[PDB]
Every structure is written in structure tokens, then in C-alpha cells.
């Protein structure tokens, strides 16, 4: 049904540190401030926003 | 659509271990845990969500 | 409009061994076992999802 | 669209040797047999469907 | 819409010498001569059509 | 609603420094001047216009 929210969500709330890896194969750090349709707010240092479009996979680190 | 949900169900019922061959050449495994129209879940050791953007190819490993 | 199924229905009805280079050079092989609005289906020695998103060309072999 | 449906009409019509530049650096080299909202279908030898979204670049060879 | 078409207008009546780049790392160059909603046709010595989607920025030379 | 637009546009009136990191891993500085739905303009020496689906990444800098 909707598995993309809740697991960003449950990743936010509890929030527990992951690692995105983007499609030309950067990986980035973090933890899930917040999300929307389109993108994903990553807080380590700095905030910064991926765009979901460049993004291959979302995994706790 | 009409095609992809029952390959990616019957991975996911029948717990078959399957590659998932991302568009930058990285191959991932594991077993489908679940889907929806945007994701899919693989896991092993962790539970990884990798968008189907990303995805170039699944195949029974 | 529509060309593209047509010419996946020719290869698929008529088994016509083909060539589906992905966006990222590599070429697969096999037959057009069937394929909807996302993806189509390689049958070669396995059944393999190929996302049409992922694909550049489609040639006969 | 508007532009695109026009350059690629004329160059089929014409019957114009193309060159499409593709994404992944590959240059297809061919006439153009027919198009539609996804494809191109790219003659000779034999007729070869090319994913737009696969496509850079389409000029006059 | 109230930014990309204004842009690319004013680019396009001024003449302006401008480099595309696509997403690829390849840089064009030339000057707008139009564009739709999914391509932009650039002309010194002959037109092409560059697509949108394998374009990553539009700037003047 | 967006999560995105107040992002960009708190970078944008703050004149903040920004770091835009391309999908080919190129990374682009500046200031927003301004967006859309599809593009980011990206202020001195010349204003470049940027195309969101090139983008990976959006980094106070
Ligand atoms: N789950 C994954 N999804 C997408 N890309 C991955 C994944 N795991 C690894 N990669 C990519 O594969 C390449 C090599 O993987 P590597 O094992 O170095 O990952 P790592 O996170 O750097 O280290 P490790 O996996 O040992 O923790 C890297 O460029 C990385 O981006
Ligand atoms: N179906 C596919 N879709 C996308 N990329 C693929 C596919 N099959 C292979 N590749 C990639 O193309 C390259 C060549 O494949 P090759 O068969 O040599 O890999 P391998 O090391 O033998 O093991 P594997 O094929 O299972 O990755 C590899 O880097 C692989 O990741
Ligand atoms: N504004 C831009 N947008 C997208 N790609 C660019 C841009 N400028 C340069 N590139 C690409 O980055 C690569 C770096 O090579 P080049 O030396 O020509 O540019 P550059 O000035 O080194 O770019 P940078 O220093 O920002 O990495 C080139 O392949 C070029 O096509
Ligand atoms: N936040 C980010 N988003 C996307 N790509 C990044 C990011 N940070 C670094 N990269 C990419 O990874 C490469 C090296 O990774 P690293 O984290 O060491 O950055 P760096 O080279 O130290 O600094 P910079 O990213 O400014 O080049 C860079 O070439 C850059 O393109």
C-alpha cells in the first residue's frame, strides 16, 4: 500500500541515524529531519535537501 | 502495474533470495520484505529501502 | 500513437531473440517474455524484471 | 510537443540520416521510421526502439 | 513556467551565445533558437533538439 | 505541502551561500536568486539556470 512514509517516518521519530546512498554512488549521513513528496531534509551538521530523484537507497548505519 | 506486483509478490510469498541490479551497475541482495508504488523493501542483516528509480533489473539471485 | 507495444507484441509473439541495452551500457539478452505500462520481462535462462526506465535500446539480436 | 513533434516529423519525412546522442554517451546513427510519445524507432539494417528518456541529443547526421 | 520560460525567452529574443550542459558532463554550445515543454532546439550551424531531461544547466557563454 | 519551497526560499531571501551537488557529482556554488516548480537560478558571476532533476543535494555552504 504506502511503505515509502512509514518507514521514513519510523526512521524520523525514532530518530535513528542512516545512510543514503545517491545514484552516482555518494554516500551521505545522517539523520531524517523531515520528508514531503519530493524531498528528504538530512540533519547532521548542517541541514541539507536531497531530492529523492538521486537517491538509490535509504539504510540504517 | 498488471506485471509487477505479482513478480515482486511472488519473491515476497515465496521468500525467494533475489539480486536487484541498481541503474549505476551496484548489485544488491537479499529477499523482498515488501513494496508499494514507489519502493521496495530488501532485507538481510538490514532492512534497506531502495527506490525503484534507482532499480535497473530484479532477478531471483 | 502507440509504436511500442506493437513492436515488443512482434518480438514476444514471434520469439525473436533480443538485445536490451541499459542506460548504463550493459546489454542483456534473451526473449520478450511479456511487459506492461513499467516494465518487461526477460526470459532467457531466468525471468528478469528489466524497468523500462533503466532501458536505452530495444534491438533485435 | 509543439517543437519536438516538427523536428522529428521532417526528419522522418525527409528521410534524413540522424544521429541520437544518448545519455550514456552511445551515438545511434539511423532514419527515422516512426515516433511517439515514448519511443523512437530508428531504422536500418534493422529497426531499433529507442526510449526517449534515453536521448541527449537529435541532430541531422 | 514563471522562471524557465522567461529565462530561456529572454535568452532566445537577445541571441545570446549560451552553454548547455547536460547531465552528462557534455557542454554545448550555441544559441536558443526555441523550445516546448520537453526540448530546446539549439542552432549555430544546424539545429538540434536537446531534450530537457539530459539537460543539468542553461547558461550564457 | 512543501517541505521544499521554504527551504529554497529561507536561502533565498537570506541571501545564503549555497553548495548545489549535480547528480554527475558536480558541485555548483552561489546564491539562489530564484526557483519554480522544475528550476533553481543560481546567482554570480552570471546567473545560471539549473534543472532540479540534475540536482542530488541543496547545502547551506
Ligand atoms: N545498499 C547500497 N545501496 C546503494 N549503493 C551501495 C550500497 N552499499 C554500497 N553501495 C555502493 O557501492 C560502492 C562500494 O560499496 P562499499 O562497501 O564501499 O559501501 P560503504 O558504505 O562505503 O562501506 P560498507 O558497505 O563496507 O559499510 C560504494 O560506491 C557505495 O556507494
Ligand atoms: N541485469 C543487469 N542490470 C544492470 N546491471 C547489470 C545487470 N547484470 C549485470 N550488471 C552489471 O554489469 C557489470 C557486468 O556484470 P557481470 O555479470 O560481470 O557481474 P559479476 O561480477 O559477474 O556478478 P553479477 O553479474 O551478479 O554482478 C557488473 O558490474 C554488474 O553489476
Ligand atoms: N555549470 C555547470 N553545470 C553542469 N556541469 C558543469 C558546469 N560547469 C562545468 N560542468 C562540467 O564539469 C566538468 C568539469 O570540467 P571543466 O574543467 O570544463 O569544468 P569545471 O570549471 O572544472 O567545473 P567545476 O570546477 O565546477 O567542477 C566538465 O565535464 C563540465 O561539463
Ligand atoms: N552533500 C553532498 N551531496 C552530494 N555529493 C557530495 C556531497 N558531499 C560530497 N559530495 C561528492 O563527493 C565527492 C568527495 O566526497 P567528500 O565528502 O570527501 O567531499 P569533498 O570532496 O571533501 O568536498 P566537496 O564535496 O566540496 O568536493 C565530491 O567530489 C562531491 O562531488
Partial sequence: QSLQDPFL???????????IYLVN????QG?????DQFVILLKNTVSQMVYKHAISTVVPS
Same sequence: chains 1, 2, 3, 4, 5, 6.
Fill in 9 to 19: 517516518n519510523a526512521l524520523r521519530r525514532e530518530r535513528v541515524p542512516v545512510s
Fill in 31 to 35: 539523520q531524517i529531519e523531515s520528508f
Fill in 25 to 28: 554512488g555518494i554516500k551521505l
